[PDB]
């Protein structure tokens, strides 16, 4: 899939010829309750980060880009990616690094007295130029140099970040309503409580813990030997929706205590009707856009392209490993082209650029994964799931009465479940577990029975240092250099690691398909 043909748009044409023959199966294979359960899962799993990130941006940018734009953009790009993408299981949505960027822009546009929404119309314009050249010249063939080392490091780091953010939100909830001896019983509630409230933090903790417990118990019940197998697997597939419904009912029947609910905009309108419309003029809204910034937008366009490219390609590598029983094919060139082109086009209408998020796509793939008689058997690879997720995300505004009664703590438990379940397939996480195990309990795997124990532990520890370095960079104002430091692991694997490990050891430890050389 990553071979270079030498023809202009050679990779793009091969991606179309590989997946589009399976378009008929990509609709008929979704006729199963597991697909519906995965839709219900990924709907919340993509809606809640969308609501959070848009609301954050509405604060860091006088509501220039807000929940309405990040929801409409997510819906449109998800629909177009599900209908035309080569790997439909990817969930395209806003991310943290993209917020760190769209924040620097306002710290750059506000400093220079420039228009923030009009500068992007120009970044998105420069984004289309870059991706077309990369796709035509088969620039996606460089992904074949991203081995299991970088993929697993990135996945482990991103999962740790997700879990840390999920716990930090609960910490923030506890801080906002601390356990006090006395409270002011008359506190203004609109738009948010202006003071600490009783029982709020403890109820949020109870809801999150119960949601996580029920999700894990139903997941274990899926593989258990109780009930008829058909009903057992049907209930296990709907474990997350059942847990969400149970905890929603539990919070609903507790009337007195206040818990924060999902908040969606009133209607399909821009966030700041006093700033911009639906179509933003590339030459400026209030003041004439300078000519120099039109050519100066290439460097932010380069940074956005690097971020989106690394995220989408590493996510596609993770979700399309041959060990995951993906027997339909994945297209690196077509997905990158679609994502970057849709971002550049949506930049015109003021809607944010989106990328293939790792945790959401891995959860979407796992929610469609069918386990046979412990062993992965097949994956429900179809376009209907992502299309329905995008449609429900777009319709989230119109279904406010349903969303307004759903607590965030339930979604916090769901996020914790997603974080703990995203670490199953990572061999780095497996070798981290072996650091606390005696060598006689190590599994019958190529990297144990052919490599010395201390050599494997040293190889794992080298990866842990990279994880710490990437974590430090994230916790710094220069967090946009994370893709470069992540890329720097590839020279570490291909150059410095052979200087201390033999070829057989690196083949066993870094295997593209978990083979014994």
């Amino acid at each position: 899939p990553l071979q270079q043909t030498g023809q202009l748009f050679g990779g793009l044409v091969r991606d179309i010829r590989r997946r589009y023959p399976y378009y008929l199966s990509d609709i008929t294979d979704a006729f199963s309750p597991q697909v519906l359960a995965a839709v219900i899962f990924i709907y919340f799993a993509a809606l809640s980060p969308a609501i959070t990130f848009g609301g954050l941006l509405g604060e860091k940018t006088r509501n220039q880009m807000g929940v309405s734009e990040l929801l409409i953009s997510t819906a449109v790009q998800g629909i177009l990616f599900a209908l035309l993408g080569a790997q439909p299981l990817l969930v395209v949505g806003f991310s943290g690094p993209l917020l760190v960027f769209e924040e620097a822009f306002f710290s750059f546009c506000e400093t220079n007295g420039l228009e923030y929404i009009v500068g992007r119309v120009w970044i998105g314009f420069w984004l289309i130029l870059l991706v077309v050249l990369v796709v035509a010249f088969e620039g996606s063939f460089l992904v074949r140099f991203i081995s299991r080392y970088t993929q697993e490091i990135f996945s482990f780091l991103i999962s740790l970040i997700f879990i840390y953010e999920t716990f930090s939100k609960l910490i923030k909830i506890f801080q906002d309503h601390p356990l006090q001896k006395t409270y002011n019983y008359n506190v203004l509630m609109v738009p948010k409580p202006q003071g600490p409230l009783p029982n709020t933090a403890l109820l949020s903790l109870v809801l999150m813990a119960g949601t996580f417990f029920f999700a894990m118990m139903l997941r274990k019940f899926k593989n258990s030997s109780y009930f008829p197998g058909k009903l057992r697997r049907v209930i296990g597939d709907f474990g997350v929706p059942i847990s969400i419904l149970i905890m929603v009912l539990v919070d609903f029947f507790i009337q007195d205590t206040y818990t924060q609910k999902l908040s969606v905009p009133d209607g399909f309108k821009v966030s700041n009707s006093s700033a911009r419309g639906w179509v933003i003029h590339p030459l400026g809204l209030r003041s004439e856009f300078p000519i120099w910034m039109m050519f100066a937008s290439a460097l932010p366009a380069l940074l956005v392209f690097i971020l989106i490219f690394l995220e989408s390609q590493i996510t596609t590598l993770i979700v399309s490993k041959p060990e995951r029983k993906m027997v339909k094919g994945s297209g690196f060139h077509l997905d990158l082209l679609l994502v970057v082109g849709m971002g550049g086009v949506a930049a015109l209408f003021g809607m944010p650029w989106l990328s293939a998020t790792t945790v959401r796509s891995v959860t979407h793939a796992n929610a469609l994964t069918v386990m046979g008689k412990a062993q992965i058997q097949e994956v429900k690879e179809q376009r209907i799931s992502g299309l329905l997720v995008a449609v429900l995300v777009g319709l989230s505004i119109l279904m406010e009465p349903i969303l307004s009664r759903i607590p965030l703590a339930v979604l916090f438990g769901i996020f914790l479940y997603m974080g703990v379940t995203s670490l199953s397939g990572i061999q780095l996480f497996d070798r981290i577990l072996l650091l606390f195990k005696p060598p006689k309990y190590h599994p019958d795997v190529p990297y144990v029975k052919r490599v010395k124990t201390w050599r494997m532990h040293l190889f794992t520890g080298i990866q842990i240092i990279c994880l710490a370095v990437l974590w430090v960079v994230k916790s710094t104002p220069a967090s946009l250099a994370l893709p470069f430091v992540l890329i720097l692991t590839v020279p570490l694997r291909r150059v410095l690691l052979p200087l201390i490990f033999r070829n057989v050891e690196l083949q066993c430890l870094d295997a593209d398909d978990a083979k014994a050389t």
């Binding site: 202009l8 010249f137 179509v279 003029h281 590339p282 400026g284 209030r286 015109l348």
Partner: protein, 38 residues
């Protein structure tokens, strides 16, 4: 609200920008076709 007046409207200016971009892409493709042959 009130926006600054421009000689080109939004569809006109975006068509001009996309045409310039397509011309640049075509020029780069023709140059790359010229190389790797002589």
């Amino acid at each position: 609200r009130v926006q600054l007046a421009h000689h080109f409207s939004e569809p006109e200016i975006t068509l001009i920008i996309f045409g310039v971009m397509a011309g640049v892409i075509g020029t780069i493709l023709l140059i790359s076709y010229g190389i790797r042959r002589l």
